[PDB]
């Protein structure tokens, strides 16, 4: 039984965004919605086996905010290059026409942890049946993230996952068809 | 390009054999650079770069802090394992196996944990095999495509299966 | 539903 539990937290400027999540063997256990101040379980079935007072996370965050100001003054506010993500799109299961499936947009090896993602069906943004994850930690300093698109496989529709980051010159789009 | 400033911390609880041997690793990152560590095997803070030195100086001079730190291997790392060992550790999701020709393809999807063995039988074939590798789905399930170059049986072994699955 | 433990962030400066 060789396992790893990771309490990953951070604060980012100038976006003024924070995060507090837990990680088990690479998968998110939960995170805390800072604005709504509540524990969001990655899988709904987790709630029956454990609990976490969200207050602690907001507290840590506030301290992260404080520490960040410290770190900025210590380094003379010395900025650093951005690291652009590698985007990959693939279905969750073997794709069958007419059979409900799921598209996975995988954004990996990037930082800072802030990106805008847009699902495109036939060039048009999609706001229905779209899920996303918070910024997940890797072994290294860089981040990871998943976006999900619910769909019905047809030969007429084509999809794109558009990812915008400060490390990129222009928004990066990865394509996917049934062909 | 555009400047950014990240205070990033990872508090890692490692378990070599369940609660047998537990290790706490606190890792501090600023922007792209890891600058400070607390390894429970060392019991002290250790800067990784110039930037983490002041912190190392400060916290290591706080006896009670270091004291409470060393205890967190038990107060936090042990405490949590006993909790997760109830649902996370013993998690098992059976894989779904499908064979189809694009070059024959064995599709092993929707399974947990990650460890799995996918073998091609023609007698077993150790040639003309390429795979996407293990792919994490982000939702506590894995998937992988193992393909046999042909011009046929697919066997799957996994902790969720008492007996192996075939084609 | 036991309560999960966590490290309280430490003060810098």
């Amino acid at each position: 039984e060789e396992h790893t539990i990771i309490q990953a937290e951070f604060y980012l400027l100038p976006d003024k965004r924070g995060e507090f999540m837990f990680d088990f063997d690479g998968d998110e256990i939960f995170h805390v919605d800072i604005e709504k101040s509540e524990t969001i379980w990655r899988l709904e079935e987790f709630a029956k086996f454990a609990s976490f007072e969200a207050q602690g996370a907001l507290a840590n965050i506030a301290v992260d905010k404080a520490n960040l100001d410290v770190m900025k003054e210590r380094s003379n506010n010395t900025p650093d290059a951005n690291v652009a993500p590698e985007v990959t799109v693939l279905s969750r299961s073997p794709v069958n026409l007419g059979e409900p499936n799921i598209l996975i947009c995988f954004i990996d090896k990037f930082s800072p942890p802030v990106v805008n993602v847009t699902w495109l069906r036939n060039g048009r943004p999609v706001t229905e049946g779209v899920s996303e994850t918070v910024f997940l930690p890797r072994d290294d300093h860089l981040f990871r993230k998943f976006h999900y698109l619910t769909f019905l496989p047809s030969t007429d529709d084509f999809y794109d996952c558009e990812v915008d980051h400060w490390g990129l010159e222009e928004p990066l789009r990865k394509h996917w068809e049934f062909e | 390009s555009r400047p950014w400033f990240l205070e990033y911390c990872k508090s890692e609880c490692h378990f070599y054999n369940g609660t047998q041997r537990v290790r706490l690793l606190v890792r501090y990152f600023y922007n792209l650079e890891e600058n400070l560590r607390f390894d429970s095997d060392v019991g002290e803070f250790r800067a990784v770069t110039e930037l983490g030195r002041p912190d190392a100086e400060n916290w290591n001079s706080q006896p009670e802090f270091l004291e409470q730190k060393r205890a967190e291997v038990d107060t936090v790392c042990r405490h949590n394992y006993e909790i997760f060992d109830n649902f996370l550790v013993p998690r098992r999701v059976e894989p779904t196996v499908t064979v189809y020709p694009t070059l024959l393809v064995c599709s092993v999807s929707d399974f947990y944990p990650g460890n799995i063995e996918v073998r091609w039988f023609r007698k077993e074939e150790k040639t003309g095999i390429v795979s996407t590798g293990l792919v994490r789905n982000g939702d506590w399930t894995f998937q992988t495509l193992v393909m046999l170059e042909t011009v046929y049986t697919c066997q799957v072994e996994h902790p969720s299966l008492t007996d192996p699955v075939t084609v | 539903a036991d309560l999960i433990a966590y490290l309280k962030q430490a003060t810098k400066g």
Partner: T-cell receptor
Amino acid sequence: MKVIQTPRYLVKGQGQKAKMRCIPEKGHPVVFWYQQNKNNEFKFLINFQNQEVLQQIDMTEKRFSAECPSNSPCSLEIQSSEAGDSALYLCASSLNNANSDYTFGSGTRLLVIE
Amino acid sequence: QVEQSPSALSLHEGTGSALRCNFTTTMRAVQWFRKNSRGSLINLFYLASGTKENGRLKSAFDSKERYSTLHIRDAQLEDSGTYFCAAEPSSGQKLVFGQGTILKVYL
């Protein structure tokens, strides 16, 4: 220094605001406020690291007003005193938010009368 | 929650006894205070593990077994007052107190 609370005693009629002052140890950024009654039962009210609130209860949010202004003593003010606000208000400081090594002050003994 | 025993104690000079705190969960550490006649909480102990001796008092703490003890030896008038144990569950930023022990040293 040490945790210094003033006034050591306080008395107010219902409806009046009752302010309480607290000065943490030297170099102690974290400040806590607890409430203890005559039955020796304690209740966490609010928590600070320097100027920013780390956590508070629902009561403190509505009925209390608390600050830790820079270069200034942390304060805790009841906006409209009730008989049930009568208790000992303990303030405690800490060096490190990670740490659980708290130092309590003398406290302020508030009494609310008609 | 914290079960602190006992409720009250009377000790003739130069005698000894023990206080105890039992916990219903994992604490990050423990702390013992003494409220003197003034009502000022004198800090007595902090410990996240093991034991500590400070004069005529010694304290122990075992987070796994969820208990802490405060021993007093060679009691003196100055020892009178109400003793309290206090601990943070490792799941919170908040402290929890015992009911306290009223100690009284008979001269």
